[PDB]
Scaffold this active site. Sequence first.
Site, PDB file in Angstrom:
ATOM      1  N   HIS A  82       0.780  -1.229   0.000  1.00 29.94           N
ATOM      2  CA  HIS A  82       0.000   0.000   0.000  1.00 29.94           C
ATOM      3  C   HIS A  82       0.820   1.292   0.000  1.00 29.94           C
ATOM      4  CE1 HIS A  82      -3.891   2.093   0.518  1.00 29.94           C
ATOM      5  NE2 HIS A  82      -4.341   0.960   0.010  1.00 29.94           N
ATOM      6  N   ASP A 161     -14.125   3.578   9.399  1.00 32.30           N
ATOM      7  CA  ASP A 161     -13.186   4.287   8.547  1.00 32.30           C
ATOM      8  C   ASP A 161     -13.885   4.921   7.342  1.00 32.30           C
ATOM      9  OD1 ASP A 161     -10.627   5.133   7.403  1.00 32.30           O
ATOM     10  OD2 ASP A 161     -10.807   3.398   6.066  1.00 32.30           O
ATOM     11  N   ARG A 168     -13.905  13.679   7.252  1.00 33.80           N
ATOM     12  CA  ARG A 168     -12.636  14.396   7.125  1.00 33.80           C
ATOM     13  C   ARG A 168     -12.579  15.135   5.792  1.00 33.80           C
ATOM     14  NH1 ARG A 168      -8.944   9.590   7.098  1.00 33.80           N
ATOM     15  NH2 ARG A 168      -7.264  11.095   6.671  1.00 33.80           N
ATOM     16  N   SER A 183      -6.207   5.024   9.276  1.00 36.17           N
ATOM     17  CA  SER A 183      -7.069   4.750   8.136  1.00 36.17           C
ATOM     18  C   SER A 183      -6.496   3.643   7.254  1.00 36.17           C
ATOM     19  CB  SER A 183      -7.275   6.020   7.312  1.00 36.17           C
ATOM     20  OG  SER A 183      -8.118   5.776   6.197  1.00 36.17           O
ATOM     21  N   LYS A 187      -7.431  -0.888   7.489  1.00 37.35           N
ATOM     22  CA  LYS A 187      -7.839  -1.606   6.295  1.00 37.35           C
ATOM     23  C   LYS A 187      -6.950  -2.805   5.966  1.00 37.35           C
ATOM     24  CE  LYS A 187      -8.576   1.811   3.157  1.00 37.35           C
ATOM     25  NZ  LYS A 187      -8.507   3.132   3.848  1.00 37.35           N
TER      26      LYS A 187
END
Lengths: 433, 433
Positions: A82, A161, A168, A183, A187
């Site tokens: 990621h 989330d 946000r 966040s 995940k």
Amino acid sequence: MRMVDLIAKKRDGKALTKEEIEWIVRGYTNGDIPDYQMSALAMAIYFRGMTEEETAALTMAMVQSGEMLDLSSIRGVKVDKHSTGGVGDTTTLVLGPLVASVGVPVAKMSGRGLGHTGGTIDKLESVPGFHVEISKDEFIRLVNENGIAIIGQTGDLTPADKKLYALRDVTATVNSIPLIASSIMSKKIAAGADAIVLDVKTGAGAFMKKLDEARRLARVMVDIGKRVGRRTMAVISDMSQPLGYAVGNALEVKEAIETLKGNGPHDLTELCLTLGSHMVYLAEKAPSLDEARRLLEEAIRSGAAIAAFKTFLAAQGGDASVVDDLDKLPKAAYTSTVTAAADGYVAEMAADDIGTAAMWLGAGRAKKEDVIDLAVGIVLHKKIGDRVQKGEALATIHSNRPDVLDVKEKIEAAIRLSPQPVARPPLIYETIV
Amino acid sequence: MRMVDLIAKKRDGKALTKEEIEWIVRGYTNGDIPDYQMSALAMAIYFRGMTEEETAALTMAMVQSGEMLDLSSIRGVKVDKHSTGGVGDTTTLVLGPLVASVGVPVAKMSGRGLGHTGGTIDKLESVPGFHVEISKDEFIRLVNENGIAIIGQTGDLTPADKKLYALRDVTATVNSIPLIASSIMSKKIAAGADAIVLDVKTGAGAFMKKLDEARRLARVMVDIGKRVGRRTMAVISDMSQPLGYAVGNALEVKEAIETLKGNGPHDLTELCLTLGSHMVYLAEKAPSLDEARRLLEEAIRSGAAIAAFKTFLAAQGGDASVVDDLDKLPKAAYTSTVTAAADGYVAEMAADDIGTAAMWLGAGRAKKEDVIDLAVGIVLHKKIGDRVQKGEALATIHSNRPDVLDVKEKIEAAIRLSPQPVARPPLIYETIV
Ligand SMILES: O=c1cc[nH]c(=O)[nH]1
Ligand SMILES: [Ca+2]
Ligand SMILES: [Ca+2]
């Protein structure tokens, strides 16, 4: 316990307890804590921050709000990857197929782009017929069958989330280390993989503009993974300028293909071979980082890497013939250039500006509900440090409309030339293991 | 314009233009801008602040949300008064009817609870039948026929403050100089009175912890009032401990009645005489302050002050007989006592914590739609300077529930003790004209 008293604690720079944080998250998810109190807390965090321990607790509380994927059905070490977000970030399109071609089980979920940053999901959709909306059961089958699966982030995981990020987004509290770390990690942990390799971007095209911010982000995320037993690692890479030359979707897919065939941009290749070596090593498919890299390099040279890409494509509905016939990919009707004002050396090539220019061209969306024109984008011809001659092309615009002054102007706003040689930024700043 | 773009401007430390500020106040008041964006903005203002210019623009925007009253009809100099918030501030309940008994016309707007601080509107609702929301036309007719009126906002007067005030109360965005200044001044301006006496609190139990902070807020408000042709002055009183003994709603009203009869606390009586004389002097109902002061002390002993109190209540639907019999006022089902851990002298006192504890008992709201309990609160028995012995009661809790160990520990922690004697803090610090 009152939410107001906790907002006050944070406002005054005090640390919230794990129990307070857990109370907050479940109350927000179930509706007992209204958005107006959550938005205030979020702004207070933007200004006051959190300790590494507070961020860890925030992450676990978000994991608890949803379900956990059981990937035990897949034997061996499953590896996830990621990026924090960038411009021209073709990495996943190359890295995924590359490490699976040597036997690594790749279980990856991605997201779509928004604003000046791209999304792998959007890039994958440029390939005719590719399906990204895959269920938990289809996912396991794909990984067990081909050793790789890159799908959309299926509802269901971490509802807290999904709710908090949306908030946000409309309160200007996105760019906060604690909120970004929790966040991303919530995940990955909920997704189930055994090992997680993180690519933390730093510079103009990233959320973390300063190097010291990037270091703090990578560190807390690695610590978060290790707390719950995942093999986590991270690299801090350059995003002051776009990675590679192409910025878009169909154009980034063509760049991925050229890289897998052994003819891509030096920076994209180096980043993938470096991130790849860690994925292979962590999956125990090679004794060391050096051995792992040799395998990857051989996989590219032999043709196994490009072969695994085609199989990857067809397995999800993709038209694999676009690999040896790039013309089957969506093409833009117009092409125009941006030339250099005078002789010199490129000193700036602002990723955020290039990112916005591509977005205006149709390669990105202002809001979530917007459709993308998969064929358009920008292909750079020079990077920071490169020498330029007056009148020489610095970038080519691929568009489906002849009136592109608003784009050409944004690209010109990104560049800055110098009469004397410029020092090139490091592709990789540091590695945290 | 987009609200998110404005939250981001203020978040980054930039000043909002008069046009942006008015657009925000306009949209928020008509309901087009949601509470979560406004609370996010309010928290960014807390950390970043506003300029003298921005603060004035905000004040006027909120005034322009409603209509400004014209008190010409009423002959003479009409006076207004307002506190910046504190713990146990029974002031207005005594001071209102006090000065009005000697011929000074009172046209005042008040508010409800705000964070750890009490609200006169809530305290007045403790009295059976008392209306705090009368039409502007009835407000003008009341100041004329009686020479006094204390009401609440949201009656066509400052709709924006009505909303923003309620929101700040439950989002911990109460202690910001620009939000406090604009809130108070917008009310004073819309009310229409000629003179304005402000009571700026300093110390633990106030939003302004240090004298310098308090002096700064007094200056901002006094200058805002003068700028619009109002005789504006301010007094900086002490709030490093609660005022008097009572802290709540019905419990403070009983203190008001006892003080108006000359039996009340010295520090509360004193403060009402200080501020009250300034109101009479500015109204020109007395040759000097001392003459004005002695004119007030005479209204107390003669019983014209208490008789003025009863008339005040009945005028707005209230039950005057409540003064006769305090038993007609809301009472708490439980009574508990906090005692001293050892012998010594009350050195300090975290007055804000004592105010929060009272709010925990139900004296204040946790969310916007909350319904409060007007019977609960706290009653101190010892103040700074006093000598105490182990086992001696420092306070008495009034609750609607038997279990109050949470409240009993917060109060006990707030009251510090010492071996050596300690001097009583000064009631008045400065005067800003
Ligand atoms: O901010 C504040 C404090 C006290 N009273 C108000 O009306 N506003
Ligand atoms: Ca690229
Ligand atoms: Ca009091």
